[PDB]
Every structure is written in C-alpha cells, then in structure tokens.
Amino acid sequence: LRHNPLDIQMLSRGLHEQIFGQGGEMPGEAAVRRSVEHLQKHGLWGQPAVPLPDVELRLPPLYGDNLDQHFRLLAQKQSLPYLEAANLLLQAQLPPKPPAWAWAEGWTRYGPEGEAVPVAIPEERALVFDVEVCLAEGTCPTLAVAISPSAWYSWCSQRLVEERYSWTSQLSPADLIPLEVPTDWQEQLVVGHNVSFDRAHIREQYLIQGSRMRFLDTMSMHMAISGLSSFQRSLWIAAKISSWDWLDISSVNSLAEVHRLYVGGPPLEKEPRELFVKGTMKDIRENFQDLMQYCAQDVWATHEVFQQQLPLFLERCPHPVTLAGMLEMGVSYLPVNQNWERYLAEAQGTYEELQREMKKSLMDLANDACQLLSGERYKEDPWLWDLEWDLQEFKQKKLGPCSEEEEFQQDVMARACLQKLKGTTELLPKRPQHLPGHPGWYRKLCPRLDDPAWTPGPSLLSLQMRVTPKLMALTWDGFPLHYSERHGWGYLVPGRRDNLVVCPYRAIESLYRKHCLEQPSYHHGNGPYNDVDIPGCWFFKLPHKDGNSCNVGSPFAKDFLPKMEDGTLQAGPGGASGPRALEINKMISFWRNAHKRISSQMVVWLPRSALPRAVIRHPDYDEEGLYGAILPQVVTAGTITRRAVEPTWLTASNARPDRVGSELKAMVQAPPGYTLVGADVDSQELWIAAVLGDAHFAGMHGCTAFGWMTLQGRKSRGTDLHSKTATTVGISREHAKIFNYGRIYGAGQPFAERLLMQFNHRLTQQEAAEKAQQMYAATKGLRWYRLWKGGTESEMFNKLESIATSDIPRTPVLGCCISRALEPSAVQEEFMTSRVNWVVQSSAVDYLHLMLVAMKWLFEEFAIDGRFCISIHDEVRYLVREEDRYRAALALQITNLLTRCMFAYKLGLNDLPQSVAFFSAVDIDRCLRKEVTMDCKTPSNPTGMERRYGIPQGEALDIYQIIELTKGSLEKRS
Amino acid sequence: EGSEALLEICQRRHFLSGSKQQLSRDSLLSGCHPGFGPLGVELRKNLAAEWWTSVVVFREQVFPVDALHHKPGPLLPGDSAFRLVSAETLREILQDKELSKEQLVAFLENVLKTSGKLRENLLHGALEHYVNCLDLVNKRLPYGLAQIGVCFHPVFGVKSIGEKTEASLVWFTPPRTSNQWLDFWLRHRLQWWRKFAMSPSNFSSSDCQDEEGRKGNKLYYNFPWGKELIETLWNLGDHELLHMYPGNVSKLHGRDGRKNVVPCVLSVNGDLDRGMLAYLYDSFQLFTRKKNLHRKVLKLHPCLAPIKVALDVGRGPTLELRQVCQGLFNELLENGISVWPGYLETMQSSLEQLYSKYDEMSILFTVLVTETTLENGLIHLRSRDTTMKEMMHISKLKDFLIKYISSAKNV
C-alpha cells in the first residue's frame, strides 16, 4: 500500500497499518475506470511524479476501534469537568438579591437575610460574572458582580472606595480581579456575555503558565445556535425578501435582544445616564446602588439565557470535539516586552513626521502657484483655471569721510524719527484688511494675522480640501482631475470638440500627448455627462465602489490606494511634489485607521516575583526590562460560521516595506527561554473542498480533476491553482487567489464580473461578462442535462449544494447543525450562497477544533512544557519552552497527520496521500512573522528586526529533520 | 545639465570663491578649492549653529572640546604623512659635514621620527581628553564631547592637501547599551538632516560592518550624479581607548548604574562643507507648467538663509529716506535679524533685476520705502515664497519678522 490505483503515492505502510485498519477495503474496479476516464478526458492521466521519501513512526497508541472513537474519547476527557460545572450551574436555584449592596474593599459574599461577609475570592466551581470599567480614568476595572449556584458576590477596586488624584497608568496584577484558587477541584468555569472582555480583567489570566480555568461565552453560543449573517442582521435591525419566518427565531448579539429571544418576558432596563461610558468617578461614587442593581440585573439575564441556551447547544453540536475546541480557543495569549511600547512611540512619531512633510510639500505647491497670477498664466493651467483668481484693491479711510565720536547723536536722531513715524496710527482703519493682493483662494488658507493661532504660509491647507487635488495636478490614466455638482471628483478627457474659457480647448490636450508618446468618445469609462460643459473635454466620474449614482468625496479614499502605475497619476516635479505626497499617503494609510485600536490595547506587566524561575535565571534576561502580555478579546464564535473574530490581531495584514507600523505582529515576542513554535496549514480550505468532491465522486483521492491538481500542483512550477488560473486568465496571483476563494464560497458570475471589472478599470463590461462566463464554464460547467456536469469542480459543488439543501444541514465531519436562522424551512430556498459559504468555513472550524484537541492531548500526555498561543486564519502558534522546541514540532506534525486522517475517515476514504501527510515546514522563532527569514523592514523600523531588538533568524524544519533531531519519539528520555 | 548653471549662480553671488576656470566638481568634493565666499561662510555658520543647538546645548552630558590641529612628538614610522618643519632650519642641518655621504637617504627615517603631522580627524583629541573630562560628571559613564574643526587629507606636483571642516561627537556609553545608543543617534542625526531639507527623501542611510566585525552607519546625500557620503557613525568599543592609555585599566572606569566599567566609544563625524553643498543643491530646482515660470531661486530654509531681509529706497527726498532706513536697519539688527543694506546702492536697472538678484542670494523678504511712506509709514513688502507685494506699517515690522522666524524653528 504505497500507490492507489491512480498511481498517486499514499501513506507509508508502517503508518497506514497502525492508524487505519489493516484489513480495510478497496474500491471496485468500475469506479477506478470511471475516474480514469474523467482524468484522461481532462488530460492529466500521464503525468507521473517522483515519489517522496518514505516515513516510519512509532505513533502513540490510539483509543477505541478507529480514529473517530479516539477523538471522541479525547474530547470527552478534556471536557468532562467543565460540563460538570455547567450542569451544576444549570440546576441553580438563585436566592433573592441582597437588600443593600456593600461599600467594601474587595470581594464580598451575600448570604440569606442580606448578610455580607468579606472573602478573598468566590471559591466556586462555576460563576456568572460581569465587570464594569470607567473610561474616564482608563481601563482599570471599577466594580463587578458574580453569581454562583448558591450565593451572590460583589467586587470593587480601591479606585472607587478610596479617593486620590494620582494612579499609575501602567497596569499590574495587583489591581486586577482575583478569581483563581491557590494551591474545589482545580477546573473552574466562568460564564458571561462577551466573556473575553471580563477575562481581560482577571488577575491570574496573565501568568505565563496556563491555568485550568475556562470561559464559555453566551454570545458565541447564540451565534452558533441562532446567529445571523451581516445581511440578515441588517434586515433584522431594519425590521426591529420572500420569506420572513426566520425573524422570530433569531436576533442580533446584544444581551437585551438575546434575553428577549431565548427567555422573553419584561424587557431589560438600561441606565439612560451612562455613568460608565460618559460619567466620572464621582458619579459612580454617588450612584453606587443603582449601578450595582443594573449590573445584577444584567448578570441575572445572562444566567437565564445560559440556562435556556446550553441544552440547545449540546443538541445542535453533539460531537464532544466542538466544546473542547471552543474551550481551548477561548484562552488565547500574546506575550510582549518593553519593546512593544517603543514600537507604539516610534510608529506614532513616524506618522506625525510624515504628515508634517506632506503638509510642508502642499504648502510649497501653494507658494509655487502664486506666480501663475503673472500675465494671467493661471488662465492656461488645466487645473487652477477655474479658481478665484481675483485681486482686490487696498483700502484707506479716516567722497568718504570718517565718522567722529558722538555719532550716538546721529543714532538717537534716527531713532527719534522712527518713533515719530511709529505714531501715525490715526489714519489706519481699525478693522484691518486680510492680505490684499494675494488671490482669494490663497487667502482662504491663511489664518488671521492678529489671532494667537497664526502660522506662516497657507498652514490651513490640508488633505480633504478641494484645493489639494487641484494643486497636486493629479491625473487618472493621464487625464486631469476635476470637481462638479453632478458628481464628486472625476477626470477630464481632452479629446472633445464642437463646443463641448479657452484653456481646456487647446492647453489640456498637450498633457495627453506627453503620456501617449511616453508609453462619441473613443475612451470608455464611467460615462459622460453633458450637464458639465467644459469646452472641448468630457467629464467622467471616478468609479465609486458602490456603482454609479454615487459621488466620490475625495480621490484619497481607501479604495483608491491601488492608484495606477508609475507612469501616471503623478506630476513631473520632484521635491515637494505630488508623487512624494502620494507615497506618504500610501505609507500612512494603515496607521491612520489602525492607530486607535493598536494603542488602546490593554497590557499588563508582570512583576519579577510573578516570573517563572526559567526566566529569572536565564542568561538572556535583563533586570531592567518589562515583560507583559495581551489577552486578545477574540470571541470564539463571532460569525454564524462559528469562526473566531477580532479586529486587531485576527487579520490578514503582515509587515510590509511600504506601510508604517506594519510590524505589529513582530512585536509579539517570546520571553527568554521560550519560543513560538507554529505552522501554516497547506491550502486548508481548498484541500477540504477537494477531499469532499473526491469522496462524493468515487471515494478515491484525486479521482476528480480538482483534487488531482490540488495534490500534483506546486507553486514553484506555477502549476498550483492560483498561478494556473492567473496564467490562464491573465491577472496577478493575489487577484486570482481572491477570485478563486470567492468562487469557492458560492459566489456567482455577477460577483466575478464586478470584481474583475474593479481589478482593471480598462476592461469593458461586455467583455467582462465573456471572461466570467468562460472561466465559470471551465471551473463550474453546465447545470443539468438540458437548459452540474462537465466541470473540474462539478462534484464538489454538487456535494456542497446537496448538503446545504438538506433538511438540517450539518458539517460532514463533526455534524454541528447550521443555525436556525438558515434552515430551509425558515428561509425556503433563500440565502443559498450563505449556506454554501457556511459549509466550507464550518468544516474549516471543525479542522481547527480537531487540531486544538490533538495538540492539547499530545502536550498533556508527554509533559510538553508548552501552551497554546494563538491561531490566526489557517496558521497556529504555541508558546513552548525552549528545551522542548523540537519535541513540540514533532507533535504538531503528528497532529496534522491525524487531523487529515480524521478528515479522510469520516468521508469513507481509507488512505491519505503522502503529499499532505505532514506540514511542508515547521517554524521555530522568538517572534511572530510570516517567515523566519524576513527582517521586517518598515518605515517605522528601517534598520530591521535583527538590528534594533536583537531577534535572530528562526528555523524552518522538515519532517525528516525533526525525526532525526528527536529520533521519532516524544519521550523526554530521548 | 543644471550642475553648470547652479555653480555659475553660486559663484556669482559669492557663495563660492575663485575664478570660473578653477572651480569644478572634483575640487569641491576633494576640499582643495580656494574657499567659500562671504555668503558661503554665513551659510556654514548658520549650519554649525543649528548643529550645535541640536546636539550640544539641549543635553545634560555633552561638552565642548578643543583638539590641536597638530600632534607633536614621535609616532609610528611608515605612514608617509606630511611632516612639519620650519624653513629656518632647512640650511643649518647639512652645514659642515653631517654624514653627507649616503646616510641622507636614511634621513627619511628621521623625517618619520622627528616631526609631527596635521590631525586628520577630531577623534584623537577627544580620546586624549576623555580621562580629564571624566570628572565633569562624577564618572557617570554616558557622556559626550563635541567639536567643530578643520581636518586635512592628502589627495591625488603629484599630491596635494584638501581641507574639510567637520563636526565630531564622541559619545562614551556602557557597553551593553552601546548598540541601542547607536540606533538612537542614527535616528536623531538623520532627522536633523531631514529637518531643513526641501526633499528629506534625498538624504539616505545605510548599514555597514567593519572588517573587524564592528557595526556602523553611513549617511549619504543624492547629488545629481550619485550618492555622496556626508556623515558616519561608528561603534569602536574599548580598542582605541585601551591602546591610548596602556597599563592600569581601572583608571578608565566610569559608573553605569552601580557598575564600574570601561565605556564603549561611539564616533559620529559629519562634514559641514559637504553638508552645505548638499543643502545648496537641494534648494535648487534640478514638465508642462514649468515652461513659463522658470524663476531661478535658492529656497534655503529660513533658519539657514544667510540674509533675512533686504532694505532699499524709492526716488524722493534722499536725506529723509536715508534717515528712516538707517533707523530701521539699526532696529532690525538690534533684534537679531540680518539685513542686506541695499539702500546704499546706486542702480541702473529695473525692479525685476533687483528681485532676481535677491532671489539668487536667498533673501526671505524685500522691504521698499517709497515717497508715500513719509506720509503714513506704510512700506512695501515682497516675500520670496509668494512674490506678492503687500503694504505694511513700520511700527510692527520687526515683531512680525521675529514671529515668522520663530515659527520656522518649530513648524
């Protein structure tokens, strides 16, 4: 068993005969013949490839008959204590609220008859917990309320009970909320709505070594059970196309709406005077009781919704894997050091500096424009001709000798004459003129001279003003810009005649020559509007991403960042010119928007006493440094897919040489003695789709053309999906990747048409339709017998549509059911694209859950001194102690194998190709970056990561290298 | 090639010196040119003042230092460097049979071990002073010594000497922070060069490593022909300091926190003549709408421009105009503004040529006193940036100018 009937290398004999069954089964010959016919019709049959080296491992013993039972047992073992806690909380009989809340120092517990007693911590297996933070003083918690199945607890910080005008801004564990018990059973569960926010304020969540406490979020459970899509959310808000029966069983993620849906009854009462979001500490000190009552009400609502949701979730996701996956996904962790702060500072500085330069440049342009007044030269400039070039009149009303001594008299006489002249203030009108002689347009940018805010030059000029694009002399495909009233900013085509000021009739044309010779309108674009009647020229709107009839208020918007090639969209001048300003704008675009989120991140710095001994006595530890952590507020299920969501960290952005502040990922640095061991799954979703199609078709790997190309394709030769499509249709690799991912999720032809019209504006629509039709016919194929078949991904789409159309759609691997808001009964053949996207992305979520469970099991069994760090998109990273860096790597590889094997097992396939058996490479590094070799050069970090901070290059190991480094064993005794 | 027109203009307005034939790019780069004209000297003075303000005054542990232009005493033979000898002794040596057969060839060795040399860099004197200056800060290790001076370099009768004025800062640090400090200065200095630049992107930096493995950075300006070095930063460790003071190591110690250690040395050396030339090139022009408004002007920064305002007169009662111009000139100078006394000139050309001349000289503003001024004290003011005239009352002129300059320091 080394090659399947289709001459595709499979898993090695030693691994196959210990992961799967030795007996097993083999496909019939008819299916093999059908697959051969398919492949040879597509033209791939005769393409043998050199085999890879074989691999043999003594895999750790499994449990049960097969892989499914093994994973079930592992997940159940992981999740048992937390299900025990959840069940204990589900049966709770909550006593009444205390008659009067206490004004105390820390945690206090309230028993029968309202008695209050101070305690160190709740000391409960389960809790429902809510916190309130006053934004007026920063991010330190103010007060919180918790409920156990037996009593009420309340907590408040010293920043409320005691009053003083000085508190350190740098956060420390000494001010956070203590929950964990010292060293009744070790495992603990905390429930809440948006529980990540509450976790961020826990004292013991910032320790380097993980803890057995876990957090279950009500919002994630709601999203899983009865969540809504973005379009569905918009329509739901609009109400509170053809079928509306899904409204009564779904709602937005707000706590009030959730309680209204699951629990019902009297609505929840807010506080109209938002003393936390807009009040002050004095307001809280005055309105203590009411705020505590509101918090208790919110906690009670959260407990009720949890009671009503837990059985529903346990029913719609039976497989134990999902619960453990969420539990492990809810404990993210990002270490950082003092460098983080530096980064922020530096980035901010750079930002400001660039802005100044840009501003300066614009001012220079303004000055250079004034000269155009002479000889009415401005009247020939094809940009500034229409400005207010008016000059006002000024106003009125009401032989050498040698010096002798005592020349001081002459100086005194001159000074007296000057003083005599200084007093001639009676004639001047008191109401002064403002810079007469200067053009009015220039004067608008000049501050009043007498004001205390005066600055020299046109310091008021700035981006977003209609003047700025005119001054830069910007062009679009070499056509100058222009502003009108039937649109925002557009461009001017100079090829017009028949009287469509004389400047535009002859002066503008020359510009096009300088671009045409450097490489009824004949040019095609948005469309002319004769309402604008500039002689001898056509006006064309700048294509707005929302389609025609929309006005573009600025040519420097986000969607215009692609801009054009270096041969256009620029002006000839150099220093303080349009090109440099555009470059500066492109550089600062990212930071301009992300700076608030990035700087607002909450950071807690661990004291020395809290550090593990491995860090204190490490040779690479400095006593003067700072070590802290960020606990991202990612919600385990922020989308109906159950995919995790967070705006800051879970992003596709990475360090770039052209964007300022892009090295944020690189600032997550492991402490001394620790490393970030991780890997990126090789083409996760595409492989999932390929295996789905292959299992649907003939039960053999690679039986479909899509699966073949997925296995036998390589990026290094351009035979992978992205490169092949790019070379067949003629676009960039990234654009082809976007197109392919869009098509995979069920996007139709019109989406492709619009996207490929966006990618290059030159392409006409009547040919964009042809492009989309040809491409989809090649990929998708014809629908039915008359009026999918014949396509490379026909069977994959058939299976996806079939599973989406089922009565109760479920993930083919773990079986989690789709949200009630998308059931065919409720939607009645609506939102089909949403279901098609959901099936694939939820399969990816199941893959992630399987990875997490396997990694946790392997770490626990072999005492690997590590911890899960983060997972972003399809890449995963773990914080592992240095000495075990290699062992963990092997574990990761093992995980991959099992995971893929699992994905093959549930679809009825008893083999796994050797190509996808292991990670292409495993990364070992002390920082987060796409590759361990790049130095992360950015304008804010010009010297590189290695020069400034001292992070060396990492390692990218293979399966064989790890095997030789570890001898293929995870035991410490090796 | 604008390199010709720019240099012709620079010579004409007395930024440079010497005849037209003598001046050339190679001579300017090498440092063997005749020198700089008064405007060039003023520009260099402004640049030096800005550098000193940015580097020395604002810091608690940077002190001035003076290094002699020559180092006497014996040295290592074989350097082939020029030697200093007085012509008064160039005949008494050989008189009356002093080994005059063949030892005169070996007399070269005496030349290698009897006369001093002209210092080639300011680092050596600062290293000499290190020990004595250590008392200024009670041995607090992080501290600097700065100096602006002139250095001499051989260049290729056969070979000549070029003189270059350079600013040097030697910064002694704890070894552990050394690298960090490097980066710090690498930023600061670079930003300084970007501060006054019209095109700060033309100033660039690169990283380099010594054959001994030590780190450093090179700062370049992009002249129309290529990149030219203008400043260097080097991390030197304790090698030079240890050699210069052999024997007891402890005497080099200084305090870092509570640790006595021998400092690491960081040397920053920039060339002020090359910096001035780069700034002159940057301020020059070096497309469609430019075909008409081809004004030739040097847009030097207000903080660097040698002359701020120029004074002239209109035709009328000469004595009164002269008196008021004298008073205004005294007032402007008293407040720290540099004025070009153009009211002393007898001219034979229109205002256009006057404006062109003042633009090539980089005059920020031109003030004109006219007959009507005597009635109400309103003078004409023309700005270099805008070239637009305004009427302004005398009683406030001074203040406004100061304001302008003040803003230029911060904005």
Added chain:
Amino acid sequence: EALLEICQRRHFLSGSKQQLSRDSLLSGCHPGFGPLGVELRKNLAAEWWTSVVVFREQVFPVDALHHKPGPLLPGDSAFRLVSAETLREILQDKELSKEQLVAFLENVLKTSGKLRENLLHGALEHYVNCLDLVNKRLPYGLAQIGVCFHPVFVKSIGEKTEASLVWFTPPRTSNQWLDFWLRHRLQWWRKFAMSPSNFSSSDCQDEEGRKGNKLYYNFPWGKELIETLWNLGDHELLHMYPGNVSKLHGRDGRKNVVPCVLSVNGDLDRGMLAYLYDSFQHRKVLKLHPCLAPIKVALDVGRGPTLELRQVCQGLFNELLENGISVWPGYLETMQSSLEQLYSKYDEMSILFTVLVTETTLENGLIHLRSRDTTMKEMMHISKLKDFLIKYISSAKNV
C-alpha cells in the same frame, strides 16, 4: 599661581600640573583648554563678531585656507610640509646619494606647502573678488576668526586663535580710520573688564608702512600684548598682483584709487587668559562678566521625594535651555556634600545664580535663589525665574 590650579580643577585649562605653566600658556604650546575654557572662548568670539561684523555694512566674513600650496620663497622662518608620498618611492632606488642631496632641500621648496602664519595673507588673496560685493566702493573690510601656527624656539608649534579684520580705505583717510578702530577696540576690551584701567594702548613706528598701535593687558607680572593695528599701505597688495594695476582700483569721490590696507589682529587665547586673571582679583570666586560667563545658572534638589523634585528640575532645565540660557544640571548629583561646598564650587566655576529646589517647592511653588555677586539668599516663584534671568543678562549688556 592659585588661579592656574583653580582653573585646572574647574576644567578651564587642560593638561597636567607640569604641562600648564605661564610660558606654555602665553606661547601657545599648551595642551589645550577645558570645556569651560572652550565655552568662554566661544562667548568671546561671539561678542567680537557681533561688535565688529554684525552692526556694519562694509564688514564681511572671509574663508582663508590653513595652508598655501605651490612654490614659495626660500630660506625664511616658517613651518613647511615635507613631501608625504615621496617617503614611499625613495626606498627602492638611490640617485647616487652623496653631495647632490643638498639640492634635495631646494626640491623641498619646489613642492613644500606652508601653514597659515597669519590671516592677513588669506584675506588679501580675496580682495579682488570681494571688491565686487560692494560695487567697488573703496571702503570695505573682511573679518575672520581662525587658528594660526607659529614657530617656538628643537622648534615647536604654537597654536593661537586670532580674530583678524583687514580694512581697505582711501589713502587720504587711512590715519583717521586707524585711530577710529583703535578707540573702538580699546573700548570693546574695556567693556567686559572688572577694572578697565589695566587695559592700555601705545603707539608704534615702523620703517615701512605707517604708524600703528598696540594693546596691552597688565598681567600680574607685566604688560602683555593682546592686539595690534598696523597701517600696511599698498606694498603688499601691489606685490601680490603685479602687472596691470587697474584691476586693484576701487572707487572714491568718483575717481579710481588703489586702496590702502590696515590690519587689526587680536589674539583670543591671550584675551581669554587676561579676562580669567581679571575676574579673579576672603573667598575664591571668579566674577566673570555675565555676557562672557560660560554657565549662567546651576540647578539642584533638596530633601524630599526624588521622583518629583527630579521632574520639577527637568522641567525647569528644559524651560531655561529653550530660551538660550546655559545650565549646569546639578540636580543629577546626589547629596554627597554640604551646601557650603556646593556654593564654593559654583563660585569657583563663576556660576551667576544657584537654584535650590525643595519639597517646599511642591507645597508652595517657591524656589531658593543665591546670587554669585552678593551671597544673599532669596525666594522666587518658578514661573518667574526664567524671565528674571533674561532681564539680569539684558541689564548687564545694556549697562
């Protein structure tokens, strides 16, 4: 002398006890000056420049190179550069050696350069081109402050930083300008002195040129020259430009005239030493003039919380420096000694004012102040101090 040892202790002079001596300081072969000495010299140079150059329409800066290449006059007293590269070629072939090596000395004159003996020649070299700057208006001058090298008698090199003004005048008014400049220079030297009576002038005669004047300062051992004015005339300019004399003509009274040249050269090192001696005449204190003093005010901390007094001192330090006032960051030092020793140290350094911050500054905003010239203690609010300081200096400049 006690003054010399105090200057050595307070980083005015540079070197060691034996290296520093009267003769070495006067002749210019001293090891160098300390940072305070450099600051004092820079202040003196700035005062000289503003007095001479800033407030005059006919004085311009000039850039003279420290050496003059090309063949020179043979057999004179001045330093010359021995061939540099020639030291590498001779070591592989001998030109018969023996008594033709005397001609080697002549070959030195064929190629050897020369260091700058004085700034007069460099300025004279620029006369023709600098004449255009004033539209040939005959009266104009060139000023420059620069270092010069002198033989000292084995010979030694003495470095002297000197300020030189070359003044071109009509021959008809040369004497009037000469005595005018004499008066102005004498007044400038008297201006900063605590006892101007110790500055004197004399008139001197020469075979060539015309009369001149010498300025002397009375050091404790005798009068010493510090500056000279000479009416050189026209011989040097004519010699430097033989041939068509018309190129040397300036305009005076609508007629062409060959200018007469006067030279005013003053030694700034000697002047700095003279001022140091002057400002030292029952406590050892240097009462340097406020304009010339290198450091104006010194800051310090008092008893109380460190991380608040330190921030107050940092703010005051930044505020004082932003306005051009030099400051001694004494707040960085620990309370190692008593207050009296700190006062004495600042008195020797010539610190104008001493600032003491205390916890009472935090409680009320008051700061203790001590004045160098009076020794009386005062209390002032922080927000005022800056302005007050400027006023003080301003008064000293106007008085």
Added chain:
DNA sequence: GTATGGCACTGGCCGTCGTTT
C-alpha cells in the same frame, strides 16, 4: 444577491446679525 442603522470626523454653504463709520 439584495445592505439598514448609529456614532465620530472633517469640509463647504448658508442666511442673520452686531460693528464700523
């Protein structure tokens, strides 16, 4: 495959009205 609402931010137009003279 359709997209609603609200909040923060900046720029441009406006008709009304006190101030100057």
Added chain:
DNA sequence: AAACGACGGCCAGTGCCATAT
C-alpha cells in the same frame, strides 16, 4: 443708516461598528 466679517446650524461624504465598557 450701508456694507461688511463672523458664526451656530445644516448638508454631504468618509470611516468604523453592529458588543463590552
């Protein structure tokens, strides 16, 4: 009593987020 400069109010477009505080 006539012209003007200044200004709270209104409109439009952009960016961020459907949640906690």
